[PDB]
A and B are shown apart, each in its own frame.
With several copies, the nearest count.
Chain A
Amino acid sequence: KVETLKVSTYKPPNNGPYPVDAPKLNKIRFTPTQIDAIYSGTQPGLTIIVGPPGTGKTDVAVQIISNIYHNFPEQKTLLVAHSNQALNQLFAKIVALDIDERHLLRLGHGEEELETEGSFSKHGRVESFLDNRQRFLYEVSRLAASMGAPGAHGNSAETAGYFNKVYVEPAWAKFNDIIQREDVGPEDIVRAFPFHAYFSDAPQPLFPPEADRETVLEIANGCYRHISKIFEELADVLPFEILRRDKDKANYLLTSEARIIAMTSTHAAMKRGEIASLGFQYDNVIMEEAAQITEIENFIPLALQKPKNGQMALQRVVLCGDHYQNSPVIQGLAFRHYANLEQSLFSRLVRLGVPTINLDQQGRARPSISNLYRWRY
């Protein structure tokens, strides 16, 4: 069945006139096999990605994670890794890509060194939330000073949000009525734009003189989207200001606030009871090094949450691994040989006959070494 790919384009929404607001775009050129793996990971169900080292397994996984994050804001993505180095590489590739740190979360031991630029632990995310709170409260104070409203409205996140709902939303409604007036031109839109004083620090001009009404409205909507993004960040910070205990803040961040939560399989196994007690509600699970992690240690992420309506809420499972790579560490020789404890879910599924997508292009070593492991693959 020759599928028709109806390809459609949409204008990307502006996130503000600042160069920081420009979204990050992917720069690597994926192979057709990698693109098919990304498509299968984005589509619901079971995805199996057989990847040799240096074939971009982490790149494909991070691309699938970013695609899921952009497509479904209501879904939760559970990242399972085998090593803290793999977790750090995944977080660094996401940060090179674009997922908000207010939704990024890493679970693990607090004594482990974090090689990433940002501290993705519970206390590190709390500190980042507090720093963003201070910066955005200063921004709200600057906005209130520009608008000339009485009082200091950057006192707290709730006060900032109430100031937004009281002042900016009727002003934006009046501006939208002016826009909807058919006799109003682009210059009238420019002079009716009320955030010129707040966005005076943007690179001038805010609206070019040769710009027409469509892109003037796009720039105004980008400025309003930047303001709304700041206020939504403050609204997300606000439950952390509400809670007084750091354990309560971390529990609320794990249960509700974070949309992408990452850990190791052993940490998930030891925290299965706490996660089930807190009542996690993940939708998709993406995991790496499936041949390096045993079977039940990966089934525990598949049963972290409580079942409901006679089944599970899990929709997507992604297994990024390589069954031609090393087996896990088992001390017992009898359990290694007779009991077959060394074989993993990846090896079991590829022996059973589940369809797998194999990466067929390496980008790590010399051509001689590519042959030196291509005689096996």
Chain B
Amino acid sequence: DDAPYEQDILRNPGSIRPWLSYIEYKLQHGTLREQAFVMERACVQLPRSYKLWKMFRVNHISKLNPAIFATEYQKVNALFERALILLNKMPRIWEMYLKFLMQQPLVTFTRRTFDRALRALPITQHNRIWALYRPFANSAEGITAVKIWRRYMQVHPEDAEDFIELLIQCGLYTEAVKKYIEILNNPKFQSKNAKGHYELWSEMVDLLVEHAVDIETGHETGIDVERIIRSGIERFSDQRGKLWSGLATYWIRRGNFDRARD
């Protein structure tokens, strides 16, 4: 039954029409293992055929029961790896492989494959690629997520308050203070939660007084609590007493009672 299609394939090896006809015939009449072998041979002979490999991955995913184990998961991973070896510039293939890695519990290899995705794809597709990348960070959490979202600030600085929340949750208040200084120095940030300049100043003084012992001062980190609070004194004269009380409570949180009194 496959003999005329194989003859057509041998007559036109570089053409996609005999492969399409033979794949359609196997889909109409052939069995699942026969179809898998047929599109495997198709992907072997024409590895640049994104359409034929797309039907191959559609048939493979449709036959994939989610109850089947990591052996078939790694088989699909190897097929995706070959397709990205020879078709590295396809954002749809990258998106499907990253969705399959969302399905798998493979956090670290997913992050490394994402770094490969950034390294292969241009900046215009990086919008889609980051849009699929950030819920992985929101699910994974921790130092991996803050590395992710540091690169996300490298590409797109808009969610500063969300990164503030992750830094507070993780315990990186020194980097949070440095980020505070950088974002407030940038005179273009608008908070999406309707937080004004004084609301941001309250956020700095509140985080500093809540973790005074976790802030590494000095010029190496760029953090000078006395200088920043005195800058707030000379800038926001309405809440000068609030800033003085915040500095004093920061000093008593640190334990420097005599300097608090001074």
Contact = CB atoms under 8 A, between A and B. Distances in A.
Interface in A123-160: 150-151, 156, 158-159
Interface in A162-220: 162-163, 166
Interface string B65-86: 0000000000000000010011
Contact of B47 (A151, A156, A239, A242): A151
B119 A151 contact: no
Chain A facing B: main interface SS: helix
B123 interface: yes
A244 B123 contact: yes
B47 A158 contact: no
Interface in B85-119: 85-86, 88, 118-119
Nearest to A241: B119
Nearest to B47: A151
Contact of B85 (A150, A162, A238, A239): A162
Chain B facing A: main interface SS: helix
Interface string A326-337: 000000000000
Nearest to B48: A151
Interface in A258-272: none
A310 to B, nearest CB: 13
Contacts of A244: 122-123
B49 to A, nearest CB: 11
Contacts of B119: 158, 238-239, 242
Given A150-B47, A151-B47, A159 B88 contact: yes
B120 interface: yes
Nearest to B220: A306
Contacts of A166: 82, 85
Nearest to A163: B85
18 contacts: A150-B45, A150-B47, A151-B47, A151-B48, A151-B86, A156-B88, A158-B88, A158-B119, A158-B120, A162-B85, A162-B86, A163-B85, A166-B82, A239-B119, A242-B118, A242-B119, A242-B120, A244-B122
Given A151-B86, A159-B88, 18 more contacts: A150-B45, A150-B47, A151-B47, A151-B48, A156-B88, A158-B119, A158-B120, A159-B85, A159-B86, A162-B85, A162-B86, A163-B85, A166-B82, A238-B119, A239-B119, A242-B119, A244-B122, A244-B123
Please name the 4 residue pairs, one residue from A and one from B, whose CB atoms are nearest each other, closest first. A162-B85, A242-B119, A151-B48, A158-B88
